[PDB]
């Protein structure tokens, strides 16, 4: 009956990610119901990531002193109820939708920090990896389903409020079932040494760049492609297509990166950083062509999205392997936590807000007609290729010192005892 615990937690994860990307798929409508420009339509993701950030370490703490099942179920009930209750705000108040997003952040962070530990401490060496693998590869599926269901429900029911009321029913169901089918079961001196590790610092910066690009683009593309359709005198079959593409590029990129690094490990001992760098630079070339193909044709924009989207994810399976190769085995928990926080901070906590802000600054200094909506957004989203190229150069910088850092680690472990 452990198969049931695994399967129920996997469904919980799909729902977790489905309820992050249903505001994005109806973003165009929020603005027309509350009267806000772009800058105010970025706060809906900036505040979510700020709350998730700050709440994850604490729910990591309180998760092994006291019970667990209780904390999982409480988190699910909280975020499901706040989501459902937030589709009743009247038009006059905007800050209440933003507060909604903050509380949803707290609840989701709790669940996502605790479930892996439970599904870890129930299995063995030869199958733990398979269970964690199947649990994790529920990320692209949920992310795509977000856009899909938001668009479909809003299209059939004819009123966008209904987008925010269908997930929480499943939320309550899963939250009750995780109560009957689960069997319950010197960092200050670390940082002084982690901070002198050149490979570690450069790998952390080059993860920040990837999150910046992913967050900005994943909230701001569907709206941009709509504005493109309007200018070209051709017109919801936009978010449907974006969801469909992401649901498959997510797997394809990871398989690509694993395979290439496994062939390249037998020719030299700088395999992982060089694979990662070549992938990033290729993705930057193919991203910077959406904002050229979109003025004229749409199929070209979609092919460009496919290729750039695939090559950007190839380095998800690998940065863990770069961490476990230059850090001795007693300083690995501190390093994973510190890297995850920093990835969130210099990355997509303030990416969507920045794109919105730049777009509004451009628009305010020209006329206001649909053409200039389209151009303003196009000329604001041109930061993503720039920062992606920086990420590529940071992987090359780590591939410089990979060998010296592995050597120092080996001396340390044998020196301890």
């Amino acid at each position, epitope marked *: 009956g452990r198969g049931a615990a695994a399967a129920i937690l996997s469904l919980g994860n799909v729902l977790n990610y489905l309820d992050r990307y249903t505001v994005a798929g109806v973003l165009l409508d929020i603005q027309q119901h509350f009267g806000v420009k772009d800058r105010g339509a970025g706060l809906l993701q900036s505040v979510f990531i700020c709350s998730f950030m700050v709440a994850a370490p604490i729910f990591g703490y309180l998760g092994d002193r006291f019970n667990r099942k209780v904390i999982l179920s409480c988190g699910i009930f909280f975020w499901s109820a706040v989501t459902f209750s937030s589709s009743f705000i009247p038009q006059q108040y905007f800050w209440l939708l933003v507060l909604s997003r903050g509380l949803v952040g707290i609840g989701e962070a709790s669940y996502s920090t605790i479930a892996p530990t439970i599904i870890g401490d129930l299995f063995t060496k030869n199958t733990r990896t398979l269970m964690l693998s199947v649990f994790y590869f529920a990320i692209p599926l949920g992310s795509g389903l977000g856009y899909i269901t938001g668009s479909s429900v809003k299209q059939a029911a004819g009123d966008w409020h209904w987008a925010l009321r269908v997930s929480p029913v499943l939320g309550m169901i899963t939250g009750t079932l995780i109560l009957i089918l689960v069997p319950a079961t010197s960092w200050l001196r670390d940082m002084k040494a982690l901070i002198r590790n050149r490979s570690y610092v450069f790998s952390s910066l080059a993860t920040s760049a990837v999150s910046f690009a992913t967050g900005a683009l994943g909230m701001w593309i569907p709206l941009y492609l709509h504005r493109a359709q309007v200018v070209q005198k051709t017109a919801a079959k936009d978010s449907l297509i974006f969801g469909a593409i992401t649901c498959f590029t997510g797997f394809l990129g990871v398989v690509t990166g694993a395979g290439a690094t496994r062939w390249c490990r037998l020719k*030299t001992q700088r395999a992982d950083p060089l694979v990662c760098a070549v992938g990033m630079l290729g993705s930057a070339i193919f991203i910077c062509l959406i904002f050229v193909a979109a003025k004229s044709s749409i199929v070209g924009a979609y092919i460009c999205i496919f290729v750039g989207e695939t090559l950007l994810f190839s380095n998800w399976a690998i940065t863990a392997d770069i961490l476990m190769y230059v850090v001795i085995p007693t300083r690995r928990a501190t390093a994973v936590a510190l890297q995850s926080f920093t990835s969130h901070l210099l990355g997509d906590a303030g990416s969507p807000y920045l794109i919105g802000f730049i777009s509004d600054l451009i628009r305010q200094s020209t006329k206001d007609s649909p053409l200039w909506e389209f151009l303003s957004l196009g000329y604001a989203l041109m930061l993503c290729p720039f920062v992606v190229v920086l990420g590529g150069m940071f992987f090359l910088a780590t591939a410089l010192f990979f060998v010296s850092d592995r050597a120092r680690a*080996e001396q340390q*472990v044998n020196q301890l005892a």
Partner: nanobody
Amino acid sequence: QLVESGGGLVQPGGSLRLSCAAPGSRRFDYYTLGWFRQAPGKEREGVSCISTVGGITNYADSVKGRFIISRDNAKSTVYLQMNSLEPEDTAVYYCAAGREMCAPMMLGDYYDMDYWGKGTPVTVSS
């Protein structure tokens, strides 16, 4: 794979030299080596291991002082030199390559290595 050579029948007080090498242009320089062994009524246990950059070596508890390990990454080879053998060392010897660091309290763990060999038998009569 990795291909092993040496092995055979010696007498107590004898000596032997085993080698393990990679066929092709493969390199194994990201990591090459550790030597394991197995006997009929018992379980597989690590015998020794050698690191990647420095040239640091580690041995099990019963063979310390009698075995020696060496690595040659200029032509993809690893060597084990066995001196003053006994009747207790009759077994099958294997060669394996994995990613974890070279440390004491790492030898015994073998369910995590990437590539394995097939084995070469050593018999020490009386």
